Amino acid sequence: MKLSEVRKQLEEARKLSPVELEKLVREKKRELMELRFQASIGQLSQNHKIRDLKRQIARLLT
RNA sequence: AGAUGGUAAGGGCCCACGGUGGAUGCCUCGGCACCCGAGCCGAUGAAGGACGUGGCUACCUGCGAUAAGCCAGGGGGAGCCGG
Numbered sequence: 001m002k003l004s005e006v007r008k009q010l011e012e013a014r015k016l017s018p019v020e021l022e023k024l025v026r027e028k029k030r031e032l033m034e035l036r037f038q039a040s041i042g043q044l045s046q047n048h049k050i051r052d053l054k055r056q057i058a059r060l061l062t
Numbered sequence: 063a064g065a066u067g068g069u070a071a072g073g074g075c076c077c078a079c080g081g082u083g084g085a086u087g088c089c090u091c092g093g094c095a096c097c098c099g100a101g102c103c104g105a106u107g108a109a110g111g112a113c114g115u116g117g118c119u120a121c122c123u124g125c126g127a128u129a130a131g132c133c134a135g136g137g138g139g140a141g142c143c144g145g
């Protein structure tokens with residue numbers, strides 16, 4: 001259901017849009033690295049966080 | 063003084079049981095033929111690949127650094143996160 005949620009947020013991301021798109025993506029990107037960085041060490045990772053964040057990025061990218 | 067009976071190191075034939083081997087029968091996601099349909103794709107980068115892509119992934123499948131996926135329109139009505 002998280003889809004309907006984030007979607008509206010993105011045309012909502014039309015304060016600055018292409019610019020905030022980029023700002024927001026870059027952010028989600030870091031969170032992703034921070035994530036897999038901790039995922040590699042083992043004792044700081046669950047799971048579904050990644051794929052959810054991965055696809056999260058995708059629709060932002062759209 | 064004479065006679066003709068036992069032994070099986072092993073071998074043979076037959077019976078029983080077993081090993082090995084994978085024929086025969088049954089089966090079938092595959093193949094074959096015909097008939098009907100349908101019949102082009104590419105510089106808006108094809109056909110076909112290489113590399114990559116999953117939290118743990120060797121291969122196959124799918125996909126392309128948005129990477130077993132992204133958006134929207136239909137379908138569908140309880141399961142789903144390929145093998």
Ligand SMILES: [Mg+2]
Nearest residue numbers: 017018019022
């Ligand atoms: Mg721009």
Ligand SMILES: [Mg+2]
Nearest residue numbers: 050051054116
């Ligand atoms: Mg994933």
Ligand SMILES: [Mg+2]
Nearest residue numbers: 021060061062
């Ligand atoms: Mg955009």
Ligand SMILES: [Mg+2]
Nearest residue numbers: 063064065066
């Ligand atoms: Mg004698």
Ligand SMILES: [Mg+2]
Nearest residue numbers: 070072073074
């Ligand atoms: Mg004997």
Ligand SMILES: [Mg+2]
Nearest residue numbers: 070071072073
């Ligand atoms: Mg003997």
Ligand SMILES: [Mg+2]
Nearest residue numbers: 081082083084
């Ligand atoms: Mg056998």
Ligand SMILES: [Mg+2]
Nearest residue numbers: 104105106107
């Ligand atoms: Mg042309």
Ligand SMILES: [Mg+2]
Nearest residue numbers: 104105106107
């Ligand atoms: Mg050109």
Ligand SMILES: [Mg+2]
Nearest residue numbers: 108109110111
């Ligand atoms: Mg191709």
Ligand SMILES: [Mg+2]
Nearest residue numbers: 114115116119
């Ligand atoms: Mg990999």
Ligand SMILES: [Mg+2]
Nearest residue numbers: 051116117130
């Ligand atoms: Mg996954």
Ligand SMILES: [Mg+2]
Nearest residue numbers: 036050116117
């Ligand atoms: Mg990984």
Ligand SMILES: [Mg+2]
Nearest residue numbers: 116117118119
């Ligand atoms: Mg890996």
Ligand SMILES: [Mg+2]
Nearest residue numbers: 115122123124
């Ligand atoms: Mg592959």
Ligand SMILES: [Mg+2]
Nearest residue numbers: 054127128129
């Ligand atoms: Mg990615």
